[PDB]
């Protein structure tokens, strides 16, 4: 019943220098919210990369309303690792729900 956003796909494999696109889906619930893109560091700390209300990491909303493209522009081999998104709801209920994590390989 918590219904956290999804972070598609569990694994991106890309080549260095290439556009890498995750897609974070926050179902409906589009009245007062902020959407963060995170990457985990070796020490399991969470680093913000971009946010939907806002240049290497771009987050763009899709026509859907519910789907968001979270993309690395110039892929690298140290840009490589594990990522997730967080949905911050402000109304009706104050909430953060984070997606499950996915891997970027490049």
């Amino acid at each position: 019943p918590w219904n956290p956003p999804t972070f598609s796909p569990a694994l991106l494999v890309v080549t260095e220098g290439d556009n890498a696109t995750f897609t974070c889906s926050f179902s409906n619930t589009s009245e007062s919210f902020v959407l963060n893109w995170y990457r985990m560091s070796p020490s399991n700390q969470t680093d913000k990369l971009a946010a939907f209300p806002e240049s290497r990491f771009r987050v763009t909303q899709l026509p859907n309303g519910r789907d968001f493209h979270m993309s690395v522009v110039r892929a690298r081999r140290n840009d490589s690792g594990t990522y997730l998104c967080g949905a911050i709801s402000l109304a009706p209920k104050a909430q953060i729900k984070e997606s499950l994590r996915a891997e970027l390989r490049v």
Partner: antibody
Amino acid sequence: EQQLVESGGGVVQPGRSLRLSCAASGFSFSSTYWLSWVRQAPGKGLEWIAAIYVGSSGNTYYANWAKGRFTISKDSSSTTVFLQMNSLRAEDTAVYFCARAGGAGGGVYTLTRLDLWGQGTLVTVSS
Amino acid sequence: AAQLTQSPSSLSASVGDRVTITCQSSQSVYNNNDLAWYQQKPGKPPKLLIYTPSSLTSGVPSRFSGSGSGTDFTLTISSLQPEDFATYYCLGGYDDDSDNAFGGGTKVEIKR
């Protein structure tokens, strides 16, 4: 190194107002965080008053009993949150804590996840 | 309007004892588990013990566990330690955050 420090407590006379401050250290107010005021009268239990989303939108959340008598506000530029307390009455004598909720990596966050606290400031309402 | 009842108001136990503290809500908490438990010691701010909706990876020793869903919640200390004597508080969150409230607290004191 993250810290909350409450100030502005002291003796206040009944029927008057008092503004309290919560000064945060070690983090910025852009997003994922709410600051809350919680109070505790001498020898009694904890009581939640209100919360504010730090960050542009600035949404406020007020306990039912506190609505219309307390006002919470923020100043991102000095990472400070304010609690305005009006029509003070004797039963308002208490220690006032501010507490933070939110972050990243914890999976789910709500206003019940208060994981960072100040030491609190004593307000005595008395003539 | 939500009212959150905590029981008992105080109890006495010995080190090693199992203690259960219960917390009951007028209405279902948010998503049936927006409920937390806090430990407070005299003169000190409260400390978060259990965050039900996503069990902490913090330093709660195994002896602390929460159970319950919806309107009735339990905090269990399976093997009470000297550092556990303190007052414990539940905190409930609701569809409207304006209803959020603490229970009245449970003081756990040393039996003799």
